[PDB]
Amino acid sequence: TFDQIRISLASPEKIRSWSFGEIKKPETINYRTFKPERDGLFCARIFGPTKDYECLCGKYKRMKYKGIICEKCGVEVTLARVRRERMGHIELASPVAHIWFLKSLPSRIAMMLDMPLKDIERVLYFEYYIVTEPGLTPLKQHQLLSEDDYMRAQEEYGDDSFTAEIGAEAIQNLLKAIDLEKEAERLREELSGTVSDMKQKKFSKRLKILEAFQESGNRPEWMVLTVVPVIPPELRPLVPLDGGRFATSDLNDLYRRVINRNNRLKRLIELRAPDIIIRNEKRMLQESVDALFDNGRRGRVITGANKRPLKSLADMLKGKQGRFRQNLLGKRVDYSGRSVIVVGPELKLHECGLPKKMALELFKPFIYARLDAKGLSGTVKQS
């Protein structure tokens, strides 16, 4: 049983604890033999075996033991149901900002530290440079020098006592350096004894978000996620249709693109490429990350083959496959039938006519039980 369902932010440690293995190669299956890959999205070593009580490579297919692990293959023998309850995590070379807490109607990140939403978008796009930890020199903190001349020509005040960062790392450092108790105490005194003309409309929301982040136990630095978990290989199936032509879900495209961009960024960081190419790679990776979650806030990502827009995780739960009417509330039901209706004057008020064809199919288990108890039949299969 379970009660008191609780939802909150997921830390990187919790995501690593949930995951079993890290995926590194965007290889779904082999073209010659259809089997899972070593580090692909469909991996037996990470998401359990494919067959029931049968490991790969034909070594422990006896199905007598379930605690053993194949040495040469590398996957344990377990039922196919375990492949649906196993998740994986993806490592990111650079931090990325969550799309929900950024492009939502109320700017959650903008509510913290009194930052406008227009300025946060510039830092994430690697357009401007934000300054932090200002010394006795000019260019006070939160200056946000726009032109590059201010980052190089205006930076002629010593290589120390002046720190400037750009990208998601800037937002991460700002969220990590921010304090909750001091800001809450400062907003509490300012709220009392104030004209309350326009400052209250923002001070109330800031105090609310601060008190929520305080008692809930979630640090403000969890907004910029570092590792992204992957859905198990059962909600994004790759079942082969009739005729040998497979049919996969649209969720594999987003994960494959994210893995490819992450590998490209990792190869760029090792090769020591220029800052112009490394910046564009980080931008593309962040775009892929925050488009894999919503796909509607930023520019639409459409596949080259199909002319319809891809359905991300957010769009999958809104109106089509969410809990509105598709799976949770309204669902298909067995032991039912449909047919046209007619009028019968001879029937009573509590009696309704039922065709023999529909009644014979709906009451099949009842007929089986009656034949078993009546004694006219023997084995269930025989019945």
Partner: protein, 497 residues
Amino acid sequence: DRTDDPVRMYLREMGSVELLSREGEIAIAKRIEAGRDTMIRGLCESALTFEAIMVWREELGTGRILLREVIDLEGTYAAIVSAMEGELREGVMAILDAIASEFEAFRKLQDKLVGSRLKGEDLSDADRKAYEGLSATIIQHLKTLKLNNNRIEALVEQLYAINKRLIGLEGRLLRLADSYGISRGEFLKAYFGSELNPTWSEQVKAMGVRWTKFVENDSQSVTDIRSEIAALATETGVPIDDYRRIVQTVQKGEREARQAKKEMVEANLRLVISIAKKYTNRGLQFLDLIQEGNIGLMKAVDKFEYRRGYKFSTYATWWIRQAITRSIADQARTIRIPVHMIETINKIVRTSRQMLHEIGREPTPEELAEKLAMPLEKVRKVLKIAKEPISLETPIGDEEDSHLGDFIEDKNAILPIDAAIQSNLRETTTRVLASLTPREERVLRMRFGIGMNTDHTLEEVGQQFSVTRERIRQIEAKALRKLKHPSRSRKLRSFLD
């Protein structure tokens, strides 16, 4: 001013800062060559790279890595494959014979020099008069070697590791000294000027009268720090002898080379956009293709000399096309497809189209084997690849609803009617196993895992039973014959049908 376009921002950034240069590529190549020359001149030192690489040169005579591995042959041949590289062996042998004297010289003097540097005594010219000539001869011999890039890269990596250790020690010293309010310039210059003297930490206390409040901790740290650094320098290291300049010259050369390479790759950044535009709608986005082309261009800029093609674009276009084509066939396909497989598919498609256009109505797969000179089983297996699987969200109906995910059956799922039949069979098997004797029932349940999860072979059940191997089969046959009767196996017969 809002854009909401990553590729647009990338093109704006590359267009607002880059330009074009016809003769600029020549200047960039000359700067890269000068940087390589300065790095080579800075890396050829004594007691650090000569003795380090000499341990591998002493392994020569077996022809494993002494010749054709530590020194490039294309460079030595220009200064002058089975039939070639013959005289190069004798050349490297003569070079080793000439450098044997240089290796024997200073080998017994490096230890004396490092010991004199550690002790702190001022070294006179009595040994320097010969050390100068030895260094001149060894540098003259090393200059004519012209080693490959792998050996120099390993040497510079070892030097960078040593410099990282030294800079870590210096950072620890600075973090211990800045608590009092001491700067890095004067402290580093004093450490460099008074490194030989073992009591330099105590002799500086007289000058720094204000340091007396922390002199105790200063000594108790810096004495052990200098002892550790001296041990590290004397174990497998060369004395300093203004080693900071020798380690900074190679760093400056590498920085200049990297800056020139970055300038050259940024000047020709727009060249890849023209090539990437041709490859579109093949499974990869535009930004990914641009990034792959940039990777190819950066990989091609490393090797560019004054060959027949004096234009950098003529040599960069090949690498850009290779990078764009090699990556488009790996990620855009959605499934692991090798390069030879995709190239064979392309060749087969091209030949089939040509034959269908210039022969008849349609080329048959039978003649495609003889036309390409391949077996029928291979050409037949080439087809039916199942490329580009249909998305599960494609709307099957004309409208937006009724997607393809609904018109799909689950084969792995077991119907409840099948599971109900298994319970009946499991129960009827226990009732039928009631007329047989206990011994036959036990042996049958042991050989056949009816109530046991693990199966038992004949020998395994015989080791636990009295009958070792033979009569177990007789007992099983008797039990099977007892169950073959229609009266005892009447209800059990309906399961097989």
